[PDB]
Amino acid sequence: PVRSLNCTLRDSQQKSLVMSGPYELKALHLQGQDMEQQVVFSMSFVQGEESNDKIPVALGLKEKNLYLSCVLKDDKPTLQLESVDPKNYPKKKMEKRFVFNKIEINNKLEFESAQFPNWYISTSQAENMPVFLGGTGQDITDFTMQFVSS
């Protein structure tokens, strides 16, 4: 059965990720009690081409049938949160739209869409803006991961 880890992510400006309605995430500076708003991910280690510093993963919300995915929307590569059938997920052979290449860069991580080369999970420098898929340099594409208890 597919292996997964609970974790949080923060961008390189130490912004945490929170829900923004049902199908979007946003990034903001949180500390103290307000950190509890952050989203916990279940990162699954899925099928795909890999190397030492590039590992295919899927990013689901912990104990929710919701996954980050990359699709064309109005003809542009876009990040979305997508609902799935909870009987069938997670699985090792995730569909390509759900796969990200987790890449080590210096002491940080980037998450490249496997479907759209050189498009990355990104945040803006401004507070309270959506997490999005970026093809680029003001926008932030590097993150750190924090491990969470099972």
From Swiss-Prot:
Up-regulation conditions: By LPS. Transcription and translation induced by M.tuberculosis and a number of different M.tuberculosis components in macrophages; EsxA is the most potent activator tested (at protein level). In pancreatic islets, release is increased by high glucose treatment. In pancreatic islets and macrophages, release is also increased by endocannabinoid anandamide/AEA.
A Gene Ontology cellular-component term: lysosome
Activity regulation annotation text: (Microbial infection) Cleavage by S.pyogenes cysteine protease SpeB promotes its activation independently of CASP1. SpeB-mediated maturation of IL1B plays a dual role depending on infection site: while IL1B inflammatory response prevents bacterial growth during invasive skin infections, it promotes streptococcal infection of the nasopharynx by disrupting colonization resistance mediated by the microbiota.
Broad class of the protein's primary localization: cytoplasm
GO BP terms: apoptotic process; astrocyte activation; cell-cell signaling; cellular response to interleukin-17; cellular response to lipopolysaccharide; cellular response to mechanical stimulus; cellular response to xenobiotic stimulus; cytokine-mediated signaling pathway
Effect of residue 87 to E: Suppression of integrin binding. Markedly reduced activity. Markedly reduced activity
Impact after mutating residue 24 to N: Requires 2 nucleotide substitutions
Keywords, alphabetical: Cytokine, Cytoplasm, Inflammatory response, Lysosome, Mitogen, Pyrogen, Secreted
PTM notes: Activation of the IL1B precursor involves a CASP1-catalyzed proteolytic cleavage. Processing and secretion are temporarily associated. (Microbial infection) Cleavage by S.pyogenes cysteine protease SpeB promotes its activation independently of CASP1.
Positions of the record's site feature: Involved in receptor binding: 3
Compartment annotation: Cytoplasm, Cytosol; Secreted; Lysosome; Secreted, Extracellular exosome
Site (described: Important for interaction with integrin): 54, 62, 64, 73, 87
Tissue expression: Expressed in activated monocytes/macrophages (at protein level).
GO molecular function annotation: cytokine activity; integrin binding; interleukin-1 receptor binding; protein domain specific binding
Sequence motif Involved in interaction with TMED10 C-terminus, location on chain: 111-124
Note: The IL1B production occurs in 2 steps, each being controlled by different stimuli. First, inflammatory signals, such as LPS, stimulate the synthesis and promote the accumulation of cytosolic stores of pro-IL1B (priming). Then additional signals are required for inflammasome assembly, leading to CASP1 activation, pro-IL1B processing and eventually secretion of the active cytokine. IL1B processing and secretion are temporarily associated.
Function description: Potent pro-inflammatory cytokine. Initially discovered as the major endogenous pyrogen, induces prostaglandin synthesis, neutrophil influx and activation, T-cell activation and cytokine production, B-cell activation and antibody production, and fibroblast proliferation and collagen production. Promotes Th17 differentiation of T-cells. Synergizes with IL12/interleukin-12 to induce IFNG synthesis from T-helper 1 (Th1) cells. Plays a role in angiogenesis by inducing VEGF production synergistically with TNF and IL6.
Protein family membership: Belongs to the IL-1 family.
Subunit relationships: Monomer. In its precursor form, weakly interacts with full-length MEFV; the mature cytokine does not interact at all. Interacts with integrins ITGAV:ITGBV and ITGA5:ITGB1; integrin-binding is required for IL1B signaling. Interacts with cargo receptor TMED10; the interaction is direct and is required for the secretion of IL1B mature form. Interacts with HSP90AB1; the interaction facilitates cargo translocation into the ERGIC. Interacts with HSP90B1; the interaction facilitates cargo translocation into the ERGIC.
Name of the featured protein: Interleukin-1 beta
Organism whose genome encodes this protein: Homo sapiens (Human)
